[PDB]
């Protein structure tokens, strides 16, 4: 559905956390901060499917492919590594990619440190 499962898990968590009445729907005046906790910070996200007047999780999810299939991941990816590079332009500290953080299956290299993107 243009979204894999580690994303709808975070989206369903964030939707559930910000629907404070257990409705199944969130008000328009709250998804701004839901947006902010997920990464996207727009100014006017309107013209949505207003059939329910707020949005379901069904409406909430399908709105996001309208937003993340439009987010060019390369810019989201360099600052991702500008963040871990203290000096400008490593391989062992990157080994912490998951040795402490997350998913730790069959890592690779390119060492000789790393320099830039490689999408493939």
């Amino acid at each position: 559905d243009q979204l894999t499962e580690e994303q709808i898990a975070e989206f369903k968590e964030a939707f559930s956390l910000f629907d404070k009445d257990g409705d199944g729907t969130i008000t328009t005046k709250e998804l701004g901060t839901v947006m902010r906790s997920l990464g996207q910070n727009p100014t006017e996200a309107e013209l949505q499917d207003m059939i329910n007047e707020v949005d379901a999780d069904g409406n909430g999810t399908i709105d996001f492919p309208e937003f993340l299939t439009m987010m060019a991941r390369k810019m989201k990816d360099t600052d991702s590594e500008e963040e871990i590079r203290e000096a400008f332009r490593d391989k062992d500290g990157n080994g912490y990619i998951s040795a402490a953080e997350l998913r730790h299956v069959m890592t690779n290299l390119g060492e000789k440190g790393q320099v830039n993107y490689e999408e493939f």
Partner: protein
């Protein structure tokens, strides 16, 4: 199409509306039952604790005290200081803390370095310092008892008598909620059990009770289109199913099951000996309501199609049923019936031995799903099972005084014999109840929970001077709906357990291979834990994967597999006082064996009636100890998360008002608000911490020339974690 709930959860001033007068009549004299307020009494004990810190400083006995308990004192002081809003009361605490920090920095330099790494990581360092067995050392009551050399008020005595086990029970609300949420985290060894002088004390129910008394009384509103609110017209039963004896399949209780050419079943359910006509109408309309809303509720059960509700002659019924092996129907001559169409799987109970382990887990997952999806919709099923006023209570220690553990379950396999969980999913949905009935003095709660609604008496509660009995327990009259809610979640999961236990005892007997039965019982214990995690995820939105991990930090699946296998099979019945005493050691492995003095009946086990196995001795508790640990870990994850998220959002509103200028204050007190919000995020939930990182950065824009040296370390951890996630979501290539 749309998917949402016809129920809204809010809050209310009190549940103490039109309940029994809070009076216990004893030997002709009527004793008023009065409440010991929880927040006022707890706050007093902290103030007593603060004055005792002063006396300890003034005695120069700081070397007479182990370094581990000075760190607790110091760390709890600095935690209490951050939780306090106004800067002047925050300086009395810091003033008390400074001498303890000077002594540790000078006379205990290693402890000083370790607790400073904690102080730099969180603003409530005491919650991380007590993620282990140190939570069992009540450093605060020790200090009070040592330096407050003045007897405590009767209320203060009652409080400590009820919350002996840990200093966390004195913590102010946000700090207690954060500690309790993080006590399930991956780096926590805390388990609510400690060994006294060879005696073992379990206090998991105390964790839930201390949390519930800090809650606001919940209220649930059902919309005008809800099943229990929208007025529908009559039911149209204009077609009559025509019964023939050759087409009938089977007689299940009071329901006749008929074959059809389409291999499904037409069931006609006849009026019970004392049921009114409106009960079978309610079953009709509820089946109709669920069918209409299946898409909106994502119901997984295969719901029957209701066909008719009408009256037939008793002459006609007993002529059709003269053939098969068949009492429970009304006196004479005209019996209202309910006719519905259903798959064949709707009539196989979920404990049928003829299910492979694969359809069993899928069927349980369907039942578990709809029970809690329908609980959010506002429908509860109090009669899933004849679990027997004499009705069993899943969390009995929260609903009574003088109780300590889950009581014996009588004829437990007969209690789920006709359970309303089937292979198709849920069944017999007519005897349901609006969730608002758990939050009011309905006929249900008045009969089944009179103690919780009245207020609770005990001779040690009686004060000879005022003529009244005072207790913390009477304070739950204002909150009793919060208890019945969690108790309802728990008794859903208890019924799942007995259902799995029935399946397991029927599959494993008439089976020889010892490993092939330990594989089945280990898989049932996995089904049971998964079920608990799916309930957490439906009620909180926590991913079921992480709910599983936090559940298994607290409840031991190995012990649960072995206790179920031991006590739900009759195999221990072929034993003597020496062989089972050594087999009880393997299923508890650190904890007291299950003591009992009953004489076992061969081939059955523990049995009061000698024919059907019970779960526990006569007036003793239930031996499934890990099950009760699992039920309490589940309700505490559910309610603890809800409480944590309320505390999170109450602090989120404060941070937003500091940023928008609505509250004029300086930069240090702004960064304090943001860092405090980081401590209220759910354990293991990253987007919450990403949100707090976003606010931290905006605070650095509103106060650009302010030092961030105290906070840069902890937010850089959230920055590097957030950066890593975006890199590891680039495994778009295996």
């Amino acid at each position: 199409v749309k998917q949402y709930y016809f129920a809204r959860r809010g809050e209310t001033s009190t549940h103490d509306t039109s309940l029994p007068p809070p009076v216990k009549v004893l030997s002709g004299r009527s004793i008023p039952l009065k409440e010991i307020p929880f927040e006022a009494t707890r706050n007093e004990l902290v103030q007593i604790y603060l004055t005792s810190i002063d006396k300890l400083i003034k005695s120069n006995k700081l070397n007479s005290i182990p370094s581990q308990q000075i760190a607790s004192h110091y760390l709890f002081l600095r935690s209490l200081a951050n939780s306090e809003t106004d800067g002047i009361k925050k300086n009395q605490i810091l003033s008390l803390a400074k001498p303890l920090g000077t002594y540790l920095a000078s006379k205990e330099p290693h402890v000083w370095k370790m607790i400073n790494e904690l102080i730099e990581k969180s603003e409530y360092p005491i919650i991380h310092y007590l993620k282990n067995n140190r939570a069992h050392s009540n450093f605060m009551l020790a200090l009070i008892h040592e330096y407050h050399k003045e007897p405590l008020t009767k209320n203060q005595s009652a409080f400590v008598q009820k919350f002996r086990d840990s200093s966390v029970f004195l913590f102010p609300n946000p700090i207690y909620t954060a500690w309790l949420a993080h006590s399930y985290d991956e780096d926590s060894s805390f388990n609510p059990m400690f060994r006294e002088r060879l005696s073992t004390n379990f206090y998991h129910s105390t964790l839930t009770d201390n949390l519930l008394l800090r809650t606001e009384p919940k209220e649930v509103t059902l919309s005008s289109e809800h099943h229990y609110k929208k007025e529908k017209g009559p039911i149209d039963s204009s077609f009559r199913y025509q019964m023939s004896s050759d087409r009938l399949l089977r007689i299940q209780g009071r329901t006749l099951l008929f074959s059809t050419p389409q291999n499904d079943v037409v069931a006609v359910k006849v009026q019970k000996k004392g049921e009114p006509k409106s009960t079978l109408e309610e079953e009709f309309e509820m089946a109709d309501y669920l069918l209409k809303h299946q898409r909106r509720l994502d119901v997984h059960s295969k719901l029957p199609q209701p066909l008719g509700q009408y009256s037939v002659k008793k002459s006609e019924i007993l002529e059709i049923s003269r053939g098969s092996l068949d009492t429970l129907i009304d006196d004479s001559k005209d019996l209202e019936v309910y006719v519905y169409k259903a798959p064949q799987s709707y009539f196989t109970y979920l404990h049928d031995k003829n299910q492979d382990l694969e359809d069993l887990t899928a069927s349980v997952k369907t039942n578990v799903h709809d029970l809690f999806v329908l609980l959010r919709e506002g429908i509860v099923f109090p009669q899933l099972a004849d679990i027997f006023k004499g009705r069993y209570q899943a969390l009995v220690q929260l609903l009574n005084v003088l109780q300590f553990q889950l009581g014996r379950i009588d004829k437990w396999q007969k209690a789920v014999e006709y359970v309303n969980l089937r292979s198709s999913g849920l069944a017999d949905l007519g005897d349901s109840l609006p969730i608002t009935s758990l939050f009011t003095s309905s006929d249900f709660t008045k009969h089944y929970f009179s103690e919780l609604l009245t207020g609770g008496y005990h001779p040690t509660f009686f004060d000879k001077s005022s003529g009244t009995a005072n207790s913390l327990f009477t304070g739950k009259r204002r909150l009793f709906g919060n208890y019945l809610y969690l108790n309802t979640i728990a008794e859903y999961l208890l019924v799942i357990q007995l259902t799995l236990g029935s399946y397991g005892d029927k599959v494993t007997r008439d089976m020889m291979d010892k490993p092939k039965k330990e594989a089945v019982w280990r898989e049932l214990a996995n089904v049971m834990f998964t079920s608990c995690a799916e309930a957490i995820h439906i009620m909180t939105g926590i991913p079921q994967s992480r709910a599983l991990t936090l559940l298994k930090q607290r409840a031991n699946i190995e012990k649960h597999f072995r206790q179920t296998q031991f006590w739900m099979t009759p195999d221990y019945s072929k034993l003597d006082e020496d062989t089972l005493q050594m087999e009880q050691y393997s299923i508890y492995s650190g904890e007291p064996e299950y003591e009992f003095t009953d004489k076992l009946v061969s081939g059955v086990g523990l049995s009061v009636d000698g024919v059907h196995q019970d779960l526990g001795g006569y007036n003793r508790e239930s031996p499934l100890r890990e099950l009760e640990k699992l039920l309490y870990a589940t309700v505490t994850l559910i309610e603890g998360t809800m409480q944590l998220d309320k505390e999170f959002f109450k602090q989120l509103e404060q941070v937003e008002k500091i940023l928008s200028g609505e509250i004029k204050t300086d930069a240090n007190s702004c960064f304090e608000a943001v860092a405090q919000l980081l401590d209220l995020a759910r354990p293991g939930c990253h987007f919450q911490k990403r949100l707090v990182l976003s606010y931290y950065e905006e605070a650095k824009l509103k106060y650009p020339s302010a030092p961030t040296d105290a906070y840069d370390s902890r937010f850089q951890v959230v920055a590097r974690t957030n950066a890593a996630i975006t890199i590891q979501r680039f495994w778009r290539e295996a």
